Design a protein around this ligand. Structure first.
Ligand SMILES: O=C[C@H](O)COP(=O)(O)O
Ligand SMILES: O=C[C@H](O)COP(=O)(O)O
Lengths: 246, 246
């Protein structure tokens, strides 16, 4: 499996900070055939970012609509993304599930619209603290994946991302071993719903707090194939994180 | 007061179609100092559209976040829009209230965020068919305006838009007179909550179905200062609607 390292800049950046960050990133030598490295800037920065990054870097947007083209003010459709050759789209990120009520149904619809339009999707999911304390991790994760995994036609085009909400801003820390346990389980689900061959080829990224100190210990786990980096991807030291997957 | 004509392309467009629609818009000879003409393309189409449109036209985005910069995947903040020199933002469009659960409450926060960053805002509101048949029009409007009127500091920077939901998609039609009566009432509410000078300078656009065959009748009403055109703004004939206002 090819490792995958994605930078989700979320809602950050200015024309000038991006110019400075992209320059640093372009300095890093890596072979895109052996490693996928994707950057996800804010939508209004997509074009600026795509022109500043060397083609070895892939780019994508942080959200796509579940609707097609039409009367949907403020939405960006898969059809529109396709016309711009936008390669990746993030779906189901917890911030959208939390602040903008996105449901498993929405996640499903968006993945369907994305695949139909040849876009590659990075799908997020994970349990919260209350859910982990009740020992419902497995149950929750199973129900979230099964909400969209039948739509996956091609296992190189859909990337899964495990987000340990229970460890996001709650003060509890997730260990590499703990991440690995969940990742192994996720792969099992994919295995017993899509096939053993399919399960071994789909990338499952860890999406908790990743930095230059813990990345090597996370990437080394058997079922962790890369990351979805948050704030650490807003720094020049991001290149160090990429290197841990080389 | 200065008429305002806006094109809300919603979720439509390809690189080619925009490069064809904008060439047609640029042929129109008009003075930007006497009329405000704004085009709102899909966020990922912003740069492309800004580059193709002559400075006569102003540009903006169909939505803006109620949060600032930070961990809000997929959202476009007001400061980010400012750094890009984006001049207008649409807030509270019924499609965002309907399909995405935006409340008057999110409207006020987005308007606060926009003004706080010196962006000009186009705020939308209007009553449904069920609220109209029950004579509830004025009550509903008054509540929607009250949700954010106090935030308006400069009354040339906030543009109000009345969307007659009851006559949108219902199969019902809104006569210019029927529109003028609501606008007059809206302007009275501004007058009684902000002052007479304030109410006389603020623009209130008709945001119902507008085309070439009825634009003249509407702009003539003394309390209707322009429009937020949807579908019709996607046709080259949109220049005729702009003409009706000069
Ligand atoms: O993908 C993104 C994440 O939730 C990251 O979190 P972060 O802001 O701590 O890097
Ligand atoms: O601003 C936009 C509107 O709801 C318009 O409607 P339309 O699609 O009939 O032009």
């Amino acid at each position: 499996r090819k490792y995958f390292v994605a930078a989700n800049w979320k809602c950050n950046g200015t024309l000038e900070s991006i110019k400075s960050l992209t320059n640093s990133f372009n300095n890093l030598d890596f072979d895109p055939s052996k490693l996928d490295v994707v950057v996800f800037p804010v939508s209004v920065h997509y074009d600026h970012t795509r022109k500043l990054l060397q083609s070895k870097f892939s780019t994508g947007i942080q959200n796509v609509s579940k609707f097609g083209n039409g009367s949907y003010t403020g939405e960006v459709s898969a059809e529109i993304a396709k016309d711009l050759n936008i390669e990746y789209v993030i779906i189901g990120h917890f911030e959208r599930r939390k602040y903008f009520h996105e449901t498993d149904e929405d996640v499903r619809e968006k993945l369907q619209a994305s695949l139909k339009n040849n876009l590659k999707a990075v799908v997020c999911f994970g349990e919260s603290l209350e859910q982990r304390e009740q020992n419902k991790t497995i149950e929750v994760i199973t129900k979230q994946v099964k909400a969209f995994v039948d739509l996956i036609d091609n296992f190189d085009n859909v990337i899964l991302v495990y987000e340990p909400l229970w460890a996001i801003g709650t003060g509890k820390t997730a260990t590499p071993e703990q991440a690995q346990l969940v990742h192994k389980e996720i792969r099992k689900i994919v295995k017993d719903t899509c096939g053993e061959k399919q399960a071994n080829q789909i990338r499952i990224l860890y999406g908790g707090s990743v930095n230059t100190e813990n990345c090597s210990s996370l990437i080394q786990q058997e079922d962790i194939d890369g990351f979805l980096v948050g704030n650490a991807s807003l720094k020049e030291s991001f290149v160090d994180i990429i290197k841990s997957a080389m």
